[PDB]
Coordinates of C-alpha atoms (C1' of nucleotides) and ligand atoms in Angstrom, one line a residue:
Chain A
X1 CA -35.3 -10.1 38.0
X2 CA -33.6 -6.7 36.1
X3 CA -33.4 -7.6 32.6
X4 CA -31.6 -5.9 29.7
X5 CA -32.1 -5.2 25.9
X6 CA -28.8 -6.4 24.5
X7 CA -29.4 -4.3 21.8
X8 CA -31.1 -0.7 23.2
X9 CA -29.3 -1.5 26.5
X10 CA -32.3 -0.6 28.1
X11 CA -33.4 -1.7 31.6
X12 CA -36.6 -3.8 32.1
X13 CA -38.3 -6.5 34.0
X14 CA -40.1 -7.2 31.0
X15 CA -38.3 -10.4 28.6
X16 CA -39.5 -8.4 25.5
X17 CA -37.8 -4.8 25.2
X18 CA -40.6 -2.1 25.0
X19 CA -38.0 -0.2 23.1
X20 CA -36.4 -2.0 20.4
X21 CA -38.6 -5.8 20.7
X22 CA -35.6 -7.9 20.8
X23 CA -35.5 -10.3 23.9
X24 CA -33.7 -9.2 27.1
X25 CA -31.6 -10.8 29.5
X26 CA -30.6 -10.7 33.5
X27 CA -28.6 -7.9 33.9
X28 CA -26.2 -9.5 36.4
X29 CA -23.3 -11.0 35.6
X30 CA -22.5 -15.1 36.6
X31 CA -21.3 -16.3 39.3
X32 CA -17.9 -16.4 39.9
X33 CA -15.7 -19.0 41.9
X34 CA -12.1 -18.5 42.6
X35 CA -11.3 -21.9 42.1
X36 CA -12.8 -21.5 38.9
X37 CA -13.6 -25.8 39.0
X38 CA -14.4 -25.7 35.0
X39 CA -12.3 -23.1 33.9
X40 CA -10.9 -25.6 31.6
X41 CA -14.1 -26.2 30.3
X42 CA -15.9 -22.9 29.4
X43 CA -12.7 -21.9 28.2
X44 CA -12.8 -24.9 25.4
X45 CA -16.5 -23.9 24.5
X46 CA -15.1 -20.6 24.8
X47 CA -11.9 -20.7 22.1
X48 CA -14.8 -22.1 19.5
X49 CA -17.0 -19.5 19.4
X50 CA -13.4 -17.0 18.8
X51 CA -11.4 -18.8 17.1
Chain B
X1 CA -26.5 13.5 33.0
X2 CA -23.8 14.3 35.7
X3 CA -21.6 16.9 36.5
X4 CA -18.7 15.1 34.2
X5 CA -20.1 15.2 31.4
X6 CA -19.9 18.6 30.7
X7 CA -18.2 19.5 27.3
X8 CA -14.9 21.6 27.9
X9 CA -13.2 24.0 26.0
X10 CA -10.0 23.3 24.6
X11 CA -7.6 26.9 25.3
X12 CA -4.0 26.5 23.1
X13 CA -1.1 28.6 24.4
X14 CA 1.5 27.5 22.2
X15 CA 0.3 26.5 18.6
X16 CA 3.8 25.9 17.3
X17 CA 4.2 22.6 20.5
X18 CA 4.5 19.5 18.9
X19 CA 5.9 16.1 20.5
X20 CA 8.8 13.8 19.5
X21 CA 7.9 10.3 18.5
X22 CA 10.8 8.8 20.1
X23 CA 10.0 9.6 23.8
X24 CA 7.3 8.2 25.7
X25 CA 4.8 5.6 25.4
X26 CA 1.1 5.8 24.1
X27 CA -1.6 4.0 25.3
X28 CA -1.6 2.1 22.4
X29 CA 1.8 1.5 21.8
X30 CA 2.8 -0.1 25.3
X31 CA 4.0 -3.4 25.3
X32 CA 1.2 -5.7 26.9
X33 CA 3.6 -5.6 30.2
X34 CA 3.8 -2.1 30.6
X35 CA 0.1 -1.9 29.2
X36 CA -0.9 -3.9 32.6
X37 CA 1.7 -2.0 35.0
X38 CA -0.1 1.0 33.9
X39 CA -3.6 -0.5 33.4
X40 CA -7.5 0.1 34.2
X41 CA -9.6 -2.9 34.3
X42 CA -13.7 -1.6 33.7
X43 CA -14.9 -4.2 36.0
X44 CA -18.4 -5.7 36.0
X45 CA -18.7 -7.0 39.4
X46 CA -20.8 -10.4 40.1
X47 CA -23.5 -10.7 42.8
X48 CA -21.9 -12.4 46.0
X49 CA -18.3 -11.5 46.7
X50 CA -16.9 -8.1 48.8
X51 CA -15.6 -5.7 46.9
X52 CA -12.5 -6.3 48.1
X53 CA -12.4 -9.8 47.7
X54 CA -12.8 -10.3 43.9
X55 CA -9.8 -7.4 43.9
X56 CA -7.7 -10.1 45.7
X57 CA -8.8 -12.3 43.5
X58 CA -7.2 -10.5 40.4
X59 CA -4.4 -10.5 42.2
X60 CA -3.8 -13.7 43.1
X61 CA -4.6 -14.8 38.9
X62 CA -2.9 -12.4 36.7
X63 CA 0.1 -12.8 39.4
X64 CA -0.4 -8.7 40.1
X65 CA 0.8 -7.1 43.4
X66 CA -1.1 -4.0 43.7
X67 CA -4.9 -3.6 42.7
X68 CA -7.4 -1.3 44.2
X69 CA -10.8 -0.7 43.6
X70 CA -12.5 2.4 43.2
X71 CA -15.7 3.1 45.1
X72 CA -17.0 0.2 47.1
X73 CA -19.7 -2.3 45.7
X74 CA -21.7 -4.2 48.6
X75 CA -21.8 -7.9 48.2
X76 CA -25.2 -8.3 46.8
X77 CA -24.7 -5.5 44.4
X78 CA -23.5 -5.8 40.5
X79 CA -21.7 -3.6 38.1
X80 CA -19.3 -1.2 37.2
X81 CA -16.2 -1.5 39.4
X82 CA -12.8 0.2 37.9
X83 CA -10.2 -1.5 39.4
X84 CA -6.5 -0.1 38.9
X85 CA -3.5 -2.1 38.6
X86 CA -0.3 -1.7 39.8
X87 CA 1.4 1.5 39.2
X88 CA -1.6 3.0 37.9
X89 CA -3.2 2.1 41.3
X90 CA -3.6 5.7 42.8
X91 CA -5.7 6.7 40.2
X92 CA -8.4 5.8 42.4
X93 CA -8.4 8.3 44.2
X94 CA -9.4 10.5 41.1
X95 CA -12.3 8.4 40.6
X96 CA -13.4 8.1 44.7
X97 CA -15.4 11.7 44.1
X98 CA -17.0 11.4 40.6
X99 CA -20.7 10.4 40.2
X100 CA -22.6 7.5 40.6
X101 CA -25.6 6.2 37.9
X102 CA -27.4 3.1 39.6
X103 CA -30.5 0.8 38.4
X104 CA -32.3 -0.1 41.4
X105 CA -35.2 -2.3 42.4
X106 CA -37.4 -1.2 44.8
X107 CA -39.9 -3.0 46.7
X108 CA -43.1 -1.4 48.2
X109 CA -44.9 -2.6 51.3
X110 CA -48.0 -1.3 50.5
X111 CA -50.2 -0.6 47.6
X112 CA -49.1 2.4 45.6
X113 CA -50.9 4.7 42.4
X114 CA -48.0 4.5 39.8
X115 CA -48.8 8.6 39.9
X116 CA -48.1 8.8 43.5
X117 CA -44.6 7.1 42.9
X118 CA -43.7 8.8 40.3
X119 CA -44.7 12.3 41.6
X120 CA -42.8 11.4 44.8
X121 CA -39.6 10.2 43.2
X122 CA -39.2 13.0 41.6
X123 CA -38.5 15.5 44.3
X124 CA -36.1 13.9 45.7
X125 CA -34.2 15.3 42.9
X126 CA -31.8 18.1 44.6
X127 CA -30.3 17.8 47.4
X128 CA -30.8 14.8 50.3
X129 CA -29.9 14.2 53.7
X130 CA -28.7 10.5 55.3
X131 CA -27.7 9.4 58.3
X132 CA -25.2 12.8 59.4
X133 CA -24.6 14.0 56.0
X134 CA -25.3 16.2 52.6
X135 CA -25.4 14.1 49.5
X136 CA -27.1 14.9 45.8
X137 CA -29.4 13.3 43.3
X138 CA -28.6 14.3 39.8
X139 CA -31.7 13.0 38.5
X140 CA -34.6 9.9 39.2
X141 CA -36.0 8.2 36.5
X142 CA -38.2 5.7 36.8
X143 CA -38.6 3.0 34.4
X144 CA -41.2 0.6 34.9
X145 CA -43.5 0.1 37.5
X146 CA -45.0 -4.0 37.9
X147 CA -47.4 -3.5 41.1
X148 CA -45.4 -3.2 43.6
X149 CA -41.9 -3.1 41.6
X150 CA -40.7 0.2 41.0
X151 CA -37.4 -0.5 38.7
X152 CA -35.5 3.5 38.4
X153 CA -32.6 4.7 36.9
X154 CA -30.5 7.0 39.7
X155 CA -27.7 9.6 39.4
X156 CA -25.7 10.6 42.3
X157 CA -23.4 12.7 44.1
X158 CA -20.6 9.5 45.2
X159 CA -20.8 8.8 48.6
X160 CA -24.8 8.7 48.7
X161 CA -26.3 5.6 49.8
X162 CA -29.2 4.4 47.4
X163 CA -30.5 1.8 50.0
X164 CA -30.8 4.7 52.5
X165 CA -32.1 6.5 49.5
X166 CA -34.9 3.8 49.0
X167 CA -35.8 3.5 53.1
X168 CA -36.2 7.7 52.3
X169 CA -38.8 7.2 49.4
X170 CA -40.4 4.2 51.6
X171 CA -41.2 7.0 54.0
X172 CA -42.7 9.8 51.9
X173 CA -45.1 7.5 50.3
X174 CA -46.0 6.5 53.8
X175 CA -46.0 2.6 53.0
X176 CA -42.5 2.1 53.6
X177 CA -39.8 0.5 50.5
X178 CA -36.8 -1.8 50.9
X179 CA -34.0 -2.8 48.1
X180 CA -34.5 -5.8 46.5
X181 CA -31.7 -5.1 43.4
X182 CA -29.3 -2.8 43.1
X183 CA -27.1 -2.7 39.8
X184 CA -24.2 0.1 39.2
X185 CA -24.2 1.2 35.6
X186 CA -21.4 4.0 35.9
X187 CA -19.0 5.4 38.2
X188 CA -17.5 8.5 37.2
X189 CA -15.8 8.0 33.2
X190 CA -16.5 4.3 33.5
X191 CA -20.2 3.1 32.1
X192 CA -21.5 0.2 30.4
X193 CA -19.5 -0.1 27.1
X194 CA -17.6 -2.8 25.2
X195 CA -14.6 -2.3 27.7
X196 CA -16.7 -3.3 30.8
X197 CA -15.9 -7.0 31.5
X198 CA -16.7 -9.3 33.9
X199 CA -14.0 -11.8 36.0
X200 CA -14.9 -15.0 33.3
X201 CA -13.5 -13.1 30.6
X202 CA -10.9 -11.4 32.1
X203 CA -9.5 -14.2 33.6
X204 CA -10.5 -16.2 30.3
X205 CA -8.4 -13.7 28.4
X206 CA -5.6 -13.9 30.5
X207 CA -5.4 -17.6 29.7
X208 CA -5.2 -17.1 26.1
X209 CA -3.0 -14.9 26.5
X210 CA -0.5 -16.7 29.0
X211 CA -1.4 -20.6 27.6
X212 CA -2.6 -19.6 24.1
X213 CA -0.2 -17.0 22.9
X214 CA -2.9 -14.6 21.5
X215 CA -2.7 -11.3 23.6
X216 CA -5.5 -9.7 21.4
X217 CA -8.4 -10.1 24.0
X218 CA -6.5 -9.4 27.2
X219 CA -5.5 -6.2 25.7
X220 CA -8.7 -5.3 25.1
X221 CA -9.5 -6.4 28.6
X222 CA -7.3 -3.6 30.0
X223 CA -8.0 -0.1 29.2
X224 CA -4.9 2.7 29.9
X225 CA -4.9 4.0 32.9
X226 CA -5.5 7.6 30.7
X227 CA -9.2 6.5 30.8
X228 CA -9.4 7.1 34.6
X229 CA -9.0 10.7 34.4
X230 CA -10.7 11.4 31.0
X231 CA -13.8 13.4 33.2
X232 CA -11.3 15.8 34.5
X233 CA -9.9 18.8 33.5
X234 CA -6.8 18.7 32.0
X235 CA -3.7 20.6 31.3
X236 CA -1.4 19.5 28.8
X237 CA 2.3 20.3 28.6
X238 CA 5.2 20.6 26.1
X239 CA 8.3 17.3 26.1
X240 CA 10.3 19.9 28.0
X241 CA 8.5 19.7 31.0
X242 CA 7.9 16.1 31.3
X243 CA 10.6 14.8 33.0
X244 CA 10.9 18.0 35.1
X245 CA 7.4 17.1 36.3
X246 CA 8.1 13.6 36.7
X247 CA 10.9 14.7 39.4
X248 CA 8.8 16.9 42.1
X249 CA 9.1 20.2 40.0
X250 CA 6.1 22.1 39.7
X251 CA 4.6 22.7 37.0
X252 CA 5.2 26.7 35.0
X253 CA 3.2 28.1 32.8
X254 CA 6.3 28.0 29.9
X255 CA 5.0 24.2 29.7
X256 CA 1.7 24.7 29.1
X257 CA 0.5 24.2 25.7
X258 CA -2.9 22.8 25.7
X259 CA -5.4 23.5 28.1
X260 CA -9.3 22.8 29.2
X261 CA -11.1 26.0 29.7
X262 CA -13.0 26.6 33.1
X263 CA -10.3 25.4 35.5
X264 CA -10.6 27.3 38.8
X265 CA -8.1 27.2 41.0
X266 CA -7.6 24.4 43.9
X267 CA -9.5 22.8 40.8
X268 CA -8.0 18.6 40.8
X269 CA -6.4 18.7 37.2
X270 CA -4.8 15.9 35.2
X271 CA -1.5 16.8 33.4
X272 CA -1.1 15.1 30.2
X273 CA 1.7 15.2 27.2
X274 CA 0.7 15.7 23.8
X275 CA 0.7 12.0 23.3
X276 CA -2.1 12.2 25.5
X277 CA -0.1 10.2 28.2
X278 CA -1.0 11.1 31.6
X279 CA 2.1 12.3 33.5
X280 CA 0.9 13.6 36.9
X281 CA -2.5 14.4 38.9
X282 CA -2.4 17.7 40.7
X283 CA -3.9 21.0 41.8
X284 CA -4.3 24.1 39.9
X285 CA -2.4 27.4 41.4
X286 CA -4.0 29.1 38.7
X287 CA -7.5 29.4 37.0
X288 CA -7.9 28.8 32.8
X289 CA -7.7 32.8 32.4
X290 CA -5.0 33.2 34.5
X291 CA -2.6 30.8 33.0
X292 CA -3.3 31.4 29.5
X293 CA -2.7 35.5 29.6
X294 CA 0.7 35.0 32.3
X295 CA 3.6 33.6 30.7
X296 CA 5.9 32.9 34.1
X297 CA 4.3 31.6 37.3
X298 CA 3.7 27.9 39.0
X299 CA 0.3 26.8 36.8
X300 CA -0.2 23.5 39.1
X301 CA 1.0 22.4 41.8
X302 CA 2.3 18.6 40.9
X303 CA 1.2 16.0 43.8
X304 CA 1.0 12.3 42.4
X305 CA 3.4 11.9 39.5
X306 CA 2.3 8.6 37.4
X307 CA 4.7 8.5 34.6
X308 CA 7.6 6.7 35.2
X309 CA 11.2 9.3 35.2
X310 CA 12.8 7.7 32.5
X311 CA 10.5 7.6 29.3
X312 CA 11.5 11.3 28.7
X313 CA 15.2 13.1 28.4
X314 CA 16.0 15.5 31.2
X315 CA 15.8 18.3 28.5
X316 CA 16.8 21.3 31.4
Chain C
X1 CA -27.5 -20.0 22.1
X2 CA -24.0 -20.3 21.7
X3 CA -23.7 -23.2 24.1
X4 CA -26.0 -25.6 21.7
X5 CA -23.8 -27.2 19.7
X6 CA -26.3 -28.2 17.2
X7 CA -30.1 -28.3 16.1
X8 CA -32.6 -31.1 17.6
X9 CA -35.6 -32.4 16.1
X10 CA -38.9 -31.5 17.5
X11 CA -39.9 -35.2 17.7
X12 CA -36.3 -35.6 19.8
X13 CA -36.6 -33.3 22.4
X14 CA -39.8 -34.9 23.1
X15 CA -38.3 -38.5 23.4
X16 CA -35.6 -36.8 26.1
X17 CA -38.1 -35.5 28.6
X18 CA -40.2 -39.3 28.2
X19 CA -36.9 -41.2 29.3
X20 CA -35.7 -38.9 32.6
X21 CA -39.6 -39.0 33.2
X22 CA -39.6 -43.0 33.4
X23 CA -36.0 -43.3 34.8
X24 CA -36.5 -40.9 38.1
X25 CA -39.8 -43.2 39.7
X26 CA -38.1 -46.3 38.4
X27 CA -34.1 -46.3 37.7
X28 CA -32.1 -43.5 39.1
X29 CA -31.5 -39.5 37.9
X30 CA -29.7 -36.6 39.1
X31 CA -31.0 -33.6 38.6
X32 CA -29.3 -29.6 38.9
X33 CA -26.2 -28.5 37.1
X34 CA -23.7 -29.2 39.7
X35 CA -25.0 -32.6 40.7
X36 CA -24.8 -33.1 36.4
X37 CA -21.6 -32.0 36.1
X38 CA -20.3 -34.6 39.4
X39 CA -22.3 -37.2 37.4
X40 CA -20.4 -36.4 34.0
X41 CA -16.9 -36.1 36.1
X42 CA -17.1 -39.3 38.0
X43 CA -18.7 -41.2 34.1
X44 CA -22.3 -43.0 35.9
X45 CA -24.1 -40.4 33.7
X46 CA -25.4 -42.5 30.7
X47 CA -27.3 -39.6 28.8
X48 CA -27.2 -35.8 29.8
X49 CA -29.8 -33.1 29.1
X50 CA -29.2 -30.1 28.3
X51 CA -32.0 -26.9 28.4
X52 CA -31.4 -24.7 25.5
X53 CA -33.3 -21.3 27.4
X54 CA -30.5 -21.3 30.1
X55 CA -29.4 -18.1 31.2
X56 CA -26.6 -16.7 31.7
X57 CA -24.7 -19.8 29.4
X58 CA -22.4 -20.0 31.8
X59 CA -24.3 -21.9 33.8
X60 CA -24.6 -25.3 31.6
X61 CA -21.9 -23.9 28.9
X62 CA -19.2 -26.4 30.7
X63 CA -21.6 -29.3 30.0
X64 CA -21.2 -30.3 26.2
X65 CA -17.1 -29.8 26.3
X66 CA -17.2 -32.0 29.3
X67 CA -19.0 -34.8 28.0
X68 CA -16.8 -34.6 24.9
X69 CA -13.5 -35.8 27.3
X70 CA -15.8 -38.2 28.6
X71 CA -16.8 -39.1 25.3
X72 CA -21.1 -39.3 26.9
X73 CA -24.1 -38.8 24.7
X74 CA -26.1 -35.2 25.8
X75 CA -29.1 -33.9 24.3
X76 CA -30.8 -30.6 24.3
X77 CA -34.1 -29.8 25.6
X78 CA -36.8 -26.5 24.9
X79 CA -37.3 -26.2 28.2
X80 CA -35.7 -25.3 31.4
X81 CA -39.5 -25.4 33.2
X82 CA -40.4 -28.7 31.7
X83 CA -37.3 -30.2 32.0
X84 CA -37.5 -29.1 36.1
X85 CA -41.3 -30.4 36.0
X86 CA -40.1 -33.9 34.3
X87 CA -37.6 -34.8 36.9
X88 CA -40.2 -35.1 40.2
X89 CA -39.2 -31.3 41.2
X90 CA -42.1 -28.9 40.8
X91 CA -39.1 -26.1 40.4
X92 CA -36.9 -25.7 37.0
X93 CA -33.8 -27.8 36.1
X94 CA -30.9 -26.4 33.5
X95 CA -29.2 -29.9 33.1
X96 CA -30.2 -33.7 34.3
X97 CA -28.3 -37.0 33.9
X98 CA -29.9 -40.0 33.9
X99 CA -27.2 -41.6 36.5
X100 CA -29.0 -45.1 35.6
X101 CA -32.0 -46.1 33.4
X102 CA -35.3 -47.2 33.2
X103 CA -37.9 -48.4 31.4
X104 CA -36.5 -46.2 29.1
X105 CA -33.2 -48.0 28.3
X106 CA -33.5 -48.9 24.8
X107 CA -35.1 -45.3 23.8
X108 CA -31.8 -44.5 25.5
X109 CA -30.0 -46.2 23.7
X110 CA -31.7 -44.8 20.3
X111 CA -30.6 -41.4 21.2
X112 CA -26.9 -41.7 21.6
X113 CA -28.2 -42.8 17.8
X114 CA -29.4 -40.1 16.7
X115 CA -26.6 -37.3 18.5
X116 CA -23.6 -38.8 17.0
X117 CA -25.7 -38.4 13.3
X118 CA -25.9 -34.7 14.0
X119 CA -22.3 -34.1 14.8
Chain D
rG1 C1' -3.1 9.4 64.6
rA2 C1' -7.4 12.3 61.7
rG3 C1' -10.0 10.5 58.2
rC4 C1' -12.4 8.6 53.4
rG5 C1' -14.4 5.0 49.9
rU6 C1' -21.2 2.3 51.2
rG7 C1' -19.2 -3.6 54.1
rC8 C1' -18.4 -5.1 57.6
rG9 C1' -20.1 -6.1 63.0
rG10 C1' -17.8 -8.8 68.1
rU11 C1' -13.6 -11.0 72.0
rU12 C1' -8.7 -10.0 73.5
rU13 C1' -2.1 -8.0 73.3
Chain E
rG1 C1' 16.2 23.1 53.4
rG2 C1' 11.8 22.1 49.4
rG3 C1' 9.2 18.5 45.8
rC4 C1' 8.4 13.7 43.9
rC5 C1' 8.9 8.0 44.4
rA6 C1' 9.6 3.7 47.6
rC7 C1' 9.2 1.1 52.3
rG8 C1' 7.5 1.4 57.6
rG9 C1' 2.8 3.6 61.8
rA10 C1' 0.7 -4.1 64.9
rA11 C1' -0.8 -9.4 65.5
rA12 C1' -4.6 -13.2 66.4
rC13 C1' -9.4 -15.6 67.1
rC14 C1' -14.9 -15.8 66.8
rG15 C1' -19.7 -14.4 64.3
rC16 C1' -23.0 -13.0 59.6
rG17 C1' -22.2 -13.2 54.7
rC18 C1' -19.8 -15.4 50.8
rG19 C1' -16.9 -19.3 48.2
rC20 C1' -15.1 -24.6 47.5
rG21 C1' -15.7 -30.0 48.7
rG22 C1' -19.9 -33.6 50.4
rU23 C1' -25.3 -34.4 50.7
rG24 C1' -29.4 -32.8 47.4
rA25 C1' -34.6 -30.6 49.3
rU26 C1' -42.5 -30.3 50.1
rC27 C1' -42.2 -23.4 44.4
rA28 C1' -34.2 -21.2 46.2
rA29 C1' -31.6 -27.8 41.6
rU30 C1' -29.1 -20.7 38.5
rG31 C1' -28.9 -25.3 44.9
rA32 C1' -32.7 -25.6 50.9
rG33 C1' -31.0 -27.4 55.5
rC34 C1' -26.8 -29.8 57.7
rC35 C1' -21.5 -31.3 57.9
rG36 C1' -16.1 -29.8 56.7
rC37 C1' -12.2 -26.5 54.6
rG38 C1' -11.5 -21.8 53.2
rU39 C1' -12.1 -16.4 52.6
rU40 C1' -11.5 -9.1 52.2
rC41 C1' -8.6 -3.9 48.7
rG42 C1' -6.8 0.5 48.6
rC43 C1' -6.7 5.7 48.9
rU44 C1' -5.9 10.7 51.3
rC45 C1' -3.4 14.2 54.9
rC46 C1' 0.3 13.9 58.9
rC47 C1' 5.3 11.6 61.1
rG48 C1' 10.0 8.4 60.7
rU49 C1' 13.8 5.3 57.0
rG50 C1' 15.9 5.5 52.2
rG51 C1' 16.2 6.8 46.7
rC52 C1' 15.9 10.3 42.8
rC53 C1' 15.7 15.5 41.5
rC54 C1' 15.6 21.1 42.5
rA55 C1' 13.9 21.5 36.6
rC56 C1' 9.6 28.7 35.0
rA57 C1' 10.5 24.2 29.9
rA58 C1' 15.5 26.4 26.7
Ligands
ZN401 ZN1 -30.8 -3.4 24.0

RNA sequence: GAGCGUGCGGUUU
RNA sequence: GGGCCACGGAAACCGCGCGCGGUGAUCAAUGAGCCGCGUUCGCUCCCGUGGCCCACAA
């Protein structure tokens, strides 16, 4: 439910930012497992978008 | 804005100091080793785990032995959580009695004017009492209000327990409030910058690093453990103290060169080199005034010596 | 996002949501990231779908890598509503795979087509 | 042993 | 004698929760309910054992 503007950094429930107008996103960060089961995975999609 | 953000005065005793390049270590200058044996990680905690468990987790990943967290997340809740590695590890305690910022959600059980709220809110600015103790609220800002929602912006005294604080604002407006979302967005000179990062990244970062070769990003993950002590005062001292420090002695005002205004004494102080390496965490014996007019006397009273004994000559 | 690993016709996306429509009442779907993800591991998913509003990427970001080292056709879809409301869930769905098809096998078979053109 | 930090709460030696 | 650093001042089992594997649902598929396996950090003062120093910064 708590959003963020990833450009303001403001705080919102709203998915439009009343400050700046870009779109927000949840403000939590994902899940994470231990066992990391696709580690080897997101990492691969991961080394793309980097280089 | 908290107590720690105050802008301090820098004193200089002697103008002349300058440091040797061949002693020492800077932050940036540490091989990526010694920049983890010495290292902050600005942690973004996930929803679900204990605080204590995604520490052990760390551990058990980038093959660490030592890792504590600073103040305490709850399961449920996200965000900032510095966690110190390895020798740098007692730093914590330095951050344990900074300030707090949280984003909460709150959750009214009855029907509310978004002027009531907001009135209401707002004195609970000052001081506040939970059960049996004395806590503060730096400030209360609420955001944006969706009915029953009230999402606010909180800055605390550490130690203060928002959902009490919630329960507490529940009460005045008579309806009664519970926690529904509760995010951390700072804890004391950690906030939400490009250095805070969360576990897939980190332990992403680590793999390129260890499998890849490219230590670039894991670098980045880890911040010196300088940056856990950048909120307090500090005290900086010429390369003929450092080692002296570094074994037990106390610290004498003929080492002082640098030093932040407004320190009182009993004041917690960080000593640093000019390098801006911290050395050791202690206690001032002395305030600003004091140390800067005397020229022979114990400054500060040296009680947790970080830097290792070795990186400086025993110059007495 | 960062996740979607190229552009989709409007016309295509549309196809997508027609065949996991037919093959749910008639052939056999699984629907939900993780039971996706077992499909893609274990190689009975013929054709996954992939939402392109997911959030945080994390979620489905696994998905197209994955099917790469399994070498199976995935697609990307507007919606993570519609995709939910075309798989006999009234909830939201990030990622379905089409364990076995339906009436919709040949317009299955046209999209592995039309995926391995825009790679 | 006294404690803290919000994270823990119960049986026993 | 004093300071600093290191180690030592218990162990086990259950419960919530969480996480993995399985199943996959009558607005939680970003995963219900059930079954199985797992799962929790350090700091501060004080006291013992040991190590390094006793250094007003030249
Ligand atoms: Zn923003």
């Amino acid at each position: 439910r708590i959003r963020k503007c990833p450009k303001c950094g403001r705080y919102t429930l709203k998915e439009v930012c009343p400050v700046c107008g870009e779109k927000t996103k949840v403000a939590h960060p994902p899940r994470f497992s231990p066992e990391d089961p696709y580690g080897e995975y997101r990492r691969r999609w991961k080394r793309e978008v980097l280089g | 804005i908290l107590p720690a953000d105050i802008k301090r005065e820098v004193l200089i005793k002697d103008e002349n100091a300058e440091t040797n390049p061949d002693w020492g270590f800077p932050p940036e200058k540490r091989p990526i080793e010694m920049h983890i044996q010495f290292g902050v990680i600005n942690l973004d905690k996930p929803p679900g785990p204990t605080s204590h468990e995604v520490v052990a987790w760390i551990k058990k990943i980038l093959n660490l032995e030592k890792a504590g967290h600073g103040g305490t997340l709850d399961p449920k809740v996200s965000g900032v959580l510095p966690v110190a590695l390895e020798k740098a590890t007692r730093v914590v305690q330095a951050l344990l009695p900074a300030g707090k910022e949280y984003v909460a959600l709150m959750h009214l059980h009855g029907d509310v004017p978004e002027d009531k709220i907001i009135q209401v809110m707002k004195e609970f600015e000052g001081e506040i009492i939970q059960r049996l103790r004395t806590r503060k609220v730096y400030y209360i800002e609420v955001l944006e209000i969706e009915g029953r929602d009230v999402l606010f912006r909180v800055g605390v005294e550490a130690g203060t327990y928002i959902r009490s604080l919630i329960h507490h604002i529940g009460l005045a407006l008579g309806v009664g409030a519970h926690m529904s979302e509760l995010r951390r967005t700072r804890s004391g000179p950690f906030k939400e910058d490009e250095t805070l990062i969360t576990l897939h990244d980190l332990v992403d970062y680590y793999y390129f690093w260890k499998e890849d070769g490219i230590e670039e990003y894991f670098r980045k993950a880890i911040q010196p453990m300088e940056k856990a002590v950048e909120h307090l005062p500090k005290v900086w001292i010429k390369d003929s103290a450092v080692a002296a420090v570094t074994h037990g002695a106390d610290l004498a005002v003929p080492g002082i060169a640098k030093l932040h205004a407004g320190i009182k004494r009993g004041d917690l102080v960080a000593i640093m080199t000019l390098k801006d390496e911290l050395v050791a965490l202690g206690k001032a014996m002395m305030t600003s005034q004091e140390m800067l007019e005397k020229t022979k006397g114990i400054a500060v009273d040296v009680e947790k010596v970080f830097m290792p004994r070795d990186w400086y000559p025993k110059l007495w | 996002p960062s996740y979607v690993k190229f552009e989709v016709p409007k016309e295509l996306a549309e196809k997508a949501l027609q065949a996991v429509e037919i093959a749910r009442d008639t052939g056999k779907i699984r629907k939900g990231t993780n039971e996706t993800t077992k499909a893609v591991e274990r190689g009975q998913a013929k054709l996954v779908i992939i939402a392109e509003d997911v959030d945080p990427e994390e979620i489905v970001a696994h998905l197209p890598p994955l099917c790469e080292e399994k070498e199976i056709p995935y697609i990307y879809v507007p919606s993570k509503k519609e995709l939910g409301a075309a798989a006999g869930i009234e909830v939201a769905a990030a990622s379905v795979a089409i364990i076995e098809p339906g009436k919709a096998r040949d317009l299955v078979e046209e999209i592995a087509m039309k995926v391995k053109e825009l790679m």
